[model samples]
Target: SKIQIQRSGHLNLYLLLDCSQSVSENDFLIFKESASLMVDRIFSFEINVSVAIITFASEPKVLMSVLNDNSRDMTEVISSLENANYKDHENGTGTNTYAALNSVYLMMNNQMRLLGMETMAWQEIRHAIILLTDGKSNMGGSPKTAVDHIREILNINQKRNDYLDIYAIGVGKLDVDWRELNELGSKKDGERHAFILQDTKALHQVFEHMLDVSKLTDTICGVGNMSANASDQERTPWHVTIKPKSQETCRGALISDQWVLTAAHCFRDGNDHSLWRVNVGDPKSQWGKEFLIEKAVISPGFDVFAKKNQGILEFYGDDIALLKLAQKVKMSTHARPICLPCTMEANLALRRPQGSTCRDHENELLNKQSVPAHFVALNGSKLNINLKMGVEWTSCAEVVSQEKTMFPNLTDVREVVTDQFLCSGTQEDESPCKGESGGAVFLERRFRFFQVGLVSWGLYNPCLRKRAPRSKVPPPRDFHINLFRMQPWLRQHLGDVLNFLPL
Candidate 1:
């Protein structure tokens, strides 16, 4: 039998940067840097991705398409990020978000026609838009008009398999219209694909922006490490398999172009770095790129259930770990970064369940109590289950006292589930097994995904619990090290290339 090879999805992405006068000349320089870094990140992917730029201030200035086949177009695209030009807001007019969207539509349509419609990006492309601005639109009648126009022209569908992504961003601002962004942006499938930043300079620190996407090829948010080859349906380029010279019990996430996020417990008590081989990128017949670790940094708080000696019996506490490669792993379509929550807004985003997308600014915050979430792992012992988030656990002190375990030493749930932990799992007999501990726990806002938690420790293995001579049904909940709540600790080590939100 002949085995078929998988192909990376091609993308024709556009960056619509704001150049209105409100963004000062110096800030414009900063914005230009942000745009360039973002492009570099995009082009670095293992897949074939090209970018086009438009600086709309008093007018929309087009910077031709950067096609993989066209060296010249590529050169111009990379040459200069070019300023947003200058929009004199004081003149009482600036930034036509609507006009900008229309211009991009016109360009895409024209290019499609010139390329014979059946060829190039139009054939198999994941269309996207990155909107960067700091404040309200002073000119043009509502960008929503253009958003509607684009949807009609593109004939986009409202489905998961669909992709007309728009990453709505707010940069360098004190006040921004959160609803306007929610309204202008497109979705993965009915979700608000939005990201708001106080400043563009900090963008280098945050990877949540659509332009930053640049994961396990469809590791899909709601679905984590998948079953068999079924997961090949989505691309989660950032997903990685970490094998220490002699260790299991984990996997990892690409949080930066250079860092890998994993559970600290995977490596017990500072093991030698040489023992680690971080596998990433495509498949061999896959672009699977494995990098050797230069050093492994465990969180200052990582506890290896050490008190087992003290008879406390805990397996997960401060379970975060950061592995530094001897050299930075090259970014690829298969090895892109995922967003990690870093700020107050992020730490609290999961409190209320988020819709199609995770809530960003205060205006878009959900009034509802809780939203559905997921635990995606490549390591489900039997069959992992996607369950909704349980009520927030304020303290382990209270819950651990009530948690029951098979072992006498395990009565206190605090050992397994700690202070900064989130619990969920009403799914009868499915949860990540032992080897799946370090996988990510994220919120599935429709088709979009975000890494909000990392699989930490669950009381018992789902399969194991079943064989226990008539075990309890609807088993005890699973616990995860909440990444959002752990932001301060993560920041202390990962450097500034991340986004947490609202500072």
Candidate 2:
């Protein structure tokens, strides 16, 4: 069977503005200028991004809805904003932020539910509420209370088949509660849903940042039975070992006959490439031959330690690199290349009729959806059976339990564990121990086949005589480098090489 590709759709964003008395006429003019600039930038991308504007003082009013092509209308809206002026309330008046928020919720409900507007339907649209405010909520309703109400409404609507993502932007000053704004912007599991802007001069910059955040996708990993009746022995087997050569142990994945993909940080020091070694070709084997690093190509954006920040390498997303070996080791029976998705393939899959899993991958992309769970190996049966069986048994069980608890909380677990990584026992019956960083993680694409995650880190404790449960284990956080995060970097740096690979 041929591997498939998927691409998602454009996102929808709503700009909710606070036109309260506290906002100065000059600031309102600036807001108009900044907003228009943002629209121009969006148009430049040619992405399917659509925007709606709502203005609020004592009451909320929609200035525009789903308008992108109407340049004339957009110009009028921008002009109207400049003409609008704000005045100070006598003796400390309050802004009704909560009421405005609730108003937007009501608007969304009407469009999404009451009228069943197809364009505004939650699932098909990536909804974001961008709230721009300059003062604290003092009248009508509490901001926190309004957030609770809106969350419940969104949740209920989503359960009944509606969806929306919320983002907040607190601008200028007037005793605005940063904490409350952050909480309102946060989604479940503590991800940021808001961006606070203290410097109004940087409004354009902030808008660009929000656009980047909007584009990121979440990934997950998990383990499930490939076959219901397959025995433990029938499952794919694997082990990992790590060797740290420099200040930072770089993570890498085995792609094919002669190459390894890793972050450019691994080789940034311009040191001897021969110092690096990789272990593959065996599942149960504890050690293997180290191949000579034949050549290394770092991405164009890779930077070593910043001149001012002496020892710290300024690591960025575009830091992917490739290493070629002197000799191509015989391809491992259990390891192979996982497919890299193509843009065309993703679009085709997305455009296929809905209600069909035939284009499920594309659907996932369009919805900006991601997997939340991933699989890791716990090699329990391989430990000593006699001399230290009791001690080893306790240790193995602890590792399994810890893995179960910690896997979910790791940010972007899915994308981090990519198609190139096959999660497996860090060490048989133990978490990836010290010396296991950068080892192969094998996935079972076929019987005794394929590798995925690199053994990233291990849990070590001198207090405990035996290995602790994964919960109690203190494996290196930030141990494994996410492969999906490196995708764009890979395309920029190695697009030519990858294109030449035999399909």
Candidate 3:
């Protein structure tokens, strides 16, 4: 009867910019400003997200390296965009799209190899190359040829699951062909590829849409839009209802046809496979049978001692696990997977100081400066105190400091937790009440909705009161396990059971 929630893995994003002569100076400024805002958004999502910028004109330049919490570097990159010069072109010369593509391909290849060796764990780095250009290819080499070469490199390295996803934006009224761009953007057959932005003014919207696409890929694997009436609250293609077997009730989001994702802590003693059940159907009524879990996976790294030491809390980074159903649920208008946020988007979301504890402090700090809290509602609610929350800082820092610790051979110290999982909420006592764990933390973007974080734990009186007095008026620090951090492991264990429909 209790509904469980699961989290996904980390997301890595690379922003590739085109500085060709075809882009007008005026439009270039707009692109740069828009891009800077995008970068700012990415950084606010938290430290789990890492980003790098590559600018390509006739050649590619690494404007920034993969940075974890370096806001200064991001700011520098954005400021430097103002001085980015376009490639000098002869009057009749054409855009060298192939050369730019090739340059990025090589850059990615080298970076991936370096990261592979440094991290030791095979990384599934999701790459999105935002190609902003205004003209068709005419110089250097053929775009098709470059795509082929890149494809070959990706195929050869498919064992690592590394591939480039391109978001091509055609600015201005130039005769830039969409057909060629679409071909380069396509990762597989028939699946609609590439987000095309024809207007320069719509650049922000374009970037936002692409961010949605990235989030979609990180979670469910496939998704698309459905048309229904505005009054249809229950008309969504899929709806998930999680109810506890006992008097305790839990909430979870649907990740696949048959699988529902929830927090590991949500599974109490009563929630053995036999006692659990998942309900899937339309808003009007239930259409699918109640199913039992074939298997339940809990993170091996979950720290039972998180309550004792604040430092040990970080070890619980994203306290997420998975639930595999005995049978796959039917896919219809009422049942489908919710899209997950990729590393790029997740990073962007975390960087935003608007929704976290820091943002609250900032509001108070700003009030001292006479700024009104008109945007208070935008900050949303604070984090709930839970065992898995606030564990990343302790666990990750410890793992990094002690190289010879338990899993020394695990390359991805970051992926050891994964980026897909996200944490938020204040240390408020009443915020995430006992019954709220395993609920969905939905991010409403303009294009689509994303299930970013799962309700894991919140500060309770017992967990906080005892820890107080030992410190300044002790109160429990509320935290949530990031769902994104557990994505890679989920894909590895349950990839075949869930039917992921593409958008």
Candidate 4:
């Protein structure tokens, strides 16, 4: 357990902006926008990333500290910055790159020291300094000395692994010292993540491409690692639970910043929208923002009389729903959207070979049925079941009917197990049980996790917990709403915002 390729970890960043006079107002806006765009995406998913914003003119200045982790606070400071025009008839040409970078590093280093802890604490931290300068350093020598010092401190305690990084961005018009900053940075690969760009506005597109880190998948978002040695939890950053009428705690996944994906049976009415609150961030955490459900778009296939009767809900017609929020959620490093493979590019992104070290091993694991999909059901047992993507459609009918047929009047996978369902969980008690509806079953493709199924109905496994409740029945033999199959229904309700573009 000393080493493991865990989920993407905490991001500790220092963004240095060139507020000197040479930068035009327009170009200054570009700088802010670049910084804005970068920070905005940092919180795009639920990783724990802290940031410190600084500026260099005649001297370095701190705008916000890393503790200002909230997205709103970060955005406000970024927008509020006014360039310290190097045209400073007041001060000589301002561009203290070395000073600014060092100050921020020293500040962080001291804090790390005071804690009497390791530099990065663990490989779980991605330490970086995003330097936005114009190539001119009026103060100090080449940034190399300060850069080397900071890197030394950061890497010394990081196990010298693929963690410390730098994106030395030289923005704005041509300058005398641009190449120096680029020369001083390196990617995790030692190939510099550093680069420069002109046409100030182009920075938007520049950062836009780099901002997709939020879109990366496979780990639980918002949930901090329970312990140093625990395998990463099978939770997702986009997971949400709604408290609507409380028939059961309904689970949902955030598909967009504004939309939640869930089972229609979890909810059915728009009038009861106010009664619903989407709990995000930590799974059992009562803290953090809870979004109010404002509107609902349930599937037409959802029969109000759905599933014959309440007790008879095995596999039925479409049971999907999308709820809209009154206020769009400003994602945190902990609360963000999950990836849904909805297009060709997205499909490929999941299976990306480069930087995807576990791709082949994971694919082999799934193919060989060596990895069990984790099912964290709502108010029910949490279990692991072997995931089979190619199971025949009606395969689980016999097992389901024997234990307890959901739509018993018809039985089998006849009316049940539609194309919209992904049959899995052949394990007796290790599947979704009562009240565990609308939760996800995870599958890994190319090291990234995808929620391939939604718990709809299953054969009950009465194999109770160790000295726990005895349902006298079992968990799901097989049953779940295949979200991948319900792509059309998802798109119909959520509408394709750029959110689903790269899909």
Top TM-score prediction, candidate number: 4
Model 4: per-residue lDDT, tens digit, 16-94?
Answer: 8777776655666677767766665454433466677776776777766654444234445454444333243236446
Which portions of model 4 show Cα errors greater than 4 Å?
1-235, 268-271, 282-286, 304-315, 348-371, 377-383, 391-393, 403-408, 461-476, 498-503
True-structure RMSD for candidate 1: 15.6
The residue ranges of model 1 lying beyond 4 angstroms of the native Cα positions read: 1-234, 283-287, 306-310, 343-370, 379-416, 463-470, 499-502
Regions of candidate 3 where Cα sits further than 4 Å from its true position: 1-12, 37-48, 67-77, 80-94, 116-122, 156-162, 172-174, 200-503
Which lDDT tens digits does candidate 2 get at residues 309-358?
42222223334556776777443323333223232222221232333331
Superposition TM-score, candidate 3 onto the true structure: 0.42
Weakest 10 consecutive residues of candidate 4 by summed lDDT? 223-232
**Superposition-based RMSD of candidate 2 using all C-alpha atoms, in angstroms:** 20.0
lDDT of 3 at 108: 57
| Candidate 3, poorest ten consecutive residues by summed lDDT | 369-378
Model 2 lDDT-worst window of ten? 216-225
Could you give the candidate ranking by TM-score, starting with the highest? 4, 1, 3, 2
Candidate 1, residue 102: lDDT? 87
- RMSD per model, one decimal: 15.6, 20.0, 17.1, 17.5
Q: State candidate 2's TM-score.
A: 0.37
